mmCIF file of C-alpha atoms in Angstrom:
data_model
loop_
_atom_site.group_PDB
_atom_site.id
_atom_site.type_symbol
_atom_site.label_atom_id
_atom_site.label_comp_id
_atom_site.label_asym_id
_atom_site.label_seq_id
_atom_site.Cartn_x
_atom_site.Cartn_y
_atom_site.Cartn_z
ATOM 1 C CA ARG A 1 -1.683 9.085 26.538
ATOM 2 C CA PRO A 2 1.180 9.131 24.029
ATOM 3 C CA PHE A 3 3.176 5.854 23.612
ATOM 4 C CA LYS A 4 6.176 7.318 25.151
ATOM 5 C CA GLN A 5 4.383 8.049 28.357
ATOM 6 C CA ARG A 6 3.068 4.461 28.400
ATOM 7 C CA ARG A 7 6.286 2.437 28.049
ATOM 8 C CA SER A 8 9.675 3.176 29.640
ATOM 9 C CA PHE A 9 12.664 3.726 27.281
ATOM 10 C CA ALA A 10 14.213 0.348 28.239
ATOM 11 C CA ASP A 11 10.775 -1.379 27.495
ATOM 12 C CA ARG A 12 10.510 0.305 24.023
ATOM 13 C CA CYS A 13 14.131 -0.751 23.109
ATOM 14 C CA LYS A 14 13.177 -4.421 24.135
ATOM 15 C CA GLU A 15 10.128 -4.257 22.040
ATOM 16 C CA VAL A 16 12.121 -3.178 18.967
ATOM 17 C CA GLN A 17 14.556 -5.958 19.673
ATOM 18 C CA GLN A 18 11.869 -8.492 19.710
ATOM 19 C CA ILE A 19 10.345 -7.085 16.399
ATOM 20 C CA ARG A 20 13.856 -7.447 14.908
ATOM 21 C CA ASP A 21 13.740 -11.187 15.839
ATOM 22 C CA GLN A 22 10.024 -11.968 15.159
ATOM 23 C CA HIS A 23 9.547 -9.821 12.077
ATOM 24 C CA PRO A 24 12.989 -8.965 10.637
ATOM 25 C CA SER A 25 11.923 -7.388 7.523
ATOM 26 C CA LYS A 26 9.312 -4.906 9.143
ATOM 27 C CA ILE A 27 9.970 -1.533 10.135
ATOM 28 C CA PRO A 28 8.547 -0.802 13.741
ATOM 29 C CA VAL A 29 6.347 2.446 13.481
ATOM 30 C CA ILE A 30 4.312 4.424 16.043
ATOM 31 C CA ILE A 31 1.607 6.529 14.442
ATOM 32 C CA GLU A 32 -0.252 8.947 16.638
ATOM 33 C CA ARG A 33 -2.801 11.737 16.137
ATOM 34 C CA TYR A 34 -1.267 15.223 16.589
ATOM 35 C CA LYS A 35 -2.004 16.595 20.061
ATOM 36 C CA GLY A 36 -4.155 19.525 18.891
ATOM 37 C CA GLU A 37 -6.306 17.606 16.240
ATOM 38 C CA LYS A 38 -9.989 18.057 15.967
ATOM 39 C CA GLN A 39 -11.206 16.987 12.648
ATOM 40 C CA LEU A 40 -9.781 13.397 12.481
ATOM 41 C CA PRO A 41 -10.788 10.441 14.554
ATOM 42 C CA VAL A 42 -8.091 8.555 16.587
ATOM 43 C CA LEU A 43 -6.627 5.455 14.923
ATOM 44 C CA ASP A 44 -7.581 1.984 16.266
ATOM 45 C CA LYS A 45 -4.137 1.383 17.067
ATOM 46 C CA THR A 46 -0.578 2.922 17.545
ATOM 47 C CA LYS A 47 2.028 0.372 16.525
ATOM 48 C CA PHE A 48 2.553 -0.827 12.948
ATOM 49 C CA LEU A 49 4.863 -3.235 11.426
ATOM 50 C CA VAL A 50 5.510 -2.139 7.915
ATOM 51 C CA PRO A 51 7.217 -3.954 5.325
ATOM 52 C CA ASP A 52 10.629 -2.221 4.661
ATOM 53 C CA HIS A 53 10.046 -1.849 0.908
ATOM 54 C CA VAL A 54 6.812 0.294 1.367
ATOM 55 C CA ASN A 55 7.143 3.836 -0.123
ATOM 56 C CA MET A 56 6.237 6.590 2.488
ATOM 57 C CA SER A 57 3.690 7.825 -0.053
ATOM 58 C CA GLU A 58 1.948 4.365 -0.013
ATOM 59 C CA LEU A 59 1.991 4.514 3.828
ATOM 60 C CA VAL A 60 0.059 7.683 3.542
ATOM 61 C CA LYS A 61 -2.575 6.069 1.473
ATOM 62 C CA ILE A 62 -2.799 3.068 3.872
ATOM 63 C CA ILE A 63 -3.269 5.164 7.008
ATOM 64 C CA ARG A 64 -5.921 7.248 5.167
ATOM 65 C CA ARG A 65 -7.807 4.096 4.321
ATOM 66 C CA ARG A 66 -7.570 2.859 7.978
ATOM 67 C CA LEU A 67 -9.260 6.269 8.847
ATOM 68 C CA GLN A 68 -12.075 5.665 6.245
ATOM 69 C CA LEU A 69 -12.016 9.289 5.062
ATOM 70 C CA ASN A 70 -13.539 10.812 1.921
ATOM 71 C CA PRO A 71 -11.277 12.383 -0.590
ATOM 72 C CA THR A 72 -12.572 15.792 0.670
ATOM 73 C CA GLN A 73 -11.098 15.307 4.091
ATOM 74 C CA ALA A 74 -7.528 16.525 4.418
ATOM 75 C CA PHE A 75 -4.847 14.207 5.791
ATOM 76 C CA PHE A 76 -1.161 14.622 6.574
ATOM 77 C CA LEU A 77 1.046 11.943 7.926
ATOM 78 C CA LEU A 78 4.313 13.491 9.288
ATOM 79 C CA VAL A 79 7.968 12.316 10.338
ATOM 80 C CA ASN A 80 9.744 14.796 12.463
ATOM 81 C CA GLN A 81 7.094 17.239 11.092
ATOM 82 C CA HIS A 82 7.824 16.471 7.398
ATOM 83 C CA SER A 83 4.775 15.450 5.271
ATOM 84 C CA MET A 84 5.208 12.120 3.666
ATOM 85 C CA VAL A 85 2.518 12.521 0.936
ATOM 86 C CA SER A 86 5.198 13.106 -2.017
ATOM 87 C CA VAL A 87 8.019 10.825 -0.532
ATOM 88 C CA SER A 88 8.503 7.803 -2.675
ATOM 89 C CA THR A 89 11.473 6.680 -0.582
ATOM 90 C CA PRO A 90 11.304 3.136 0.891
ATOM 91 C CA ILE A 91 10.520 3.242 4.521
ATOM 92 C CA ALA A 92 13.713 1.246 5.037
ATOM 93 C CA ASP A 93 15.483 4.310 4.086
ATOM 94 C CA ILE A 94 13.518 6.814 6.162
ATOM 95 C CA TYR A 95 13.977 4.345 9.048
ATOM 96 C CA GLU A 96 17.705 4.528 9.039
ATOM 97 C CA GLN A 97 17.567 8.380 8.713
ATOM 98 C CA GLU A 98 14.847 9.276 11.166
ATOM 99 C CA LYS A 99 14.557 6.255 13.732
ATOM 100 C CA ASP A 100 14.145 7.224 17.340
ATOM 101 C CA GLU A 101 17.036 6.185 19.765
ATOM 102 C CA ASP A 102 14.479 3.501 21.030
ATOM 103 C CA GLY A 103 14.520 2.019 17.622
ATOM 104 C CA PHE A 104 10.856 2.992 16.757
ATOM 105 C CA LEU A 105 10.051 5.274 13.822
ATOM 106 C CA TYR A 106 7.632 7.941 15.176
ATOM 107 C CA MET A 107 4.938 9.616 13.040
ATOM 108 C CA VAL A 108 2.132 11.939 13.732
ATOM 109 C CA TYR A 109 -1.063 12.603 11.716
ATOM 110 C CA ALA A 110 -3.043 15.825 11.354
ATOM 111 C CA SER A 111 -5.759 17.458 9.095
ATOM 112 C CA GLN A 112 -3.344 20.475 8.581
ATOM 113 C CA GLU A 113 0.345 21.256 8.177
ATOM 114 C CA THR A 114 1.615 23.876 10.609
ATOM 115 C CA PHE A 115 4.100 25.651 8.148
#
């Protein structure tokens, strides 16, 4: 079940508030497998605390490693449906632009881009 179906909006806000206090320099990220996805396995976990200086292009490589893929297997990590592969922007900056109203930054991964 998606993260948002599992935790109320209030409980998500509280969780981000706590992460601000316990890990002030990490961006709180939710990474989830696209609903239709067939080729790629599910990640071992959903919630990621990412140091705010990490480039989005590095995050892409990190999640790919976590999936233990070959360099044959296509992988896309998307933020509000934008692929992050070429994005050298620090996650701190994407966070400020794209954070959910609950304070989490949501991402979705897939073996294809839709358009």
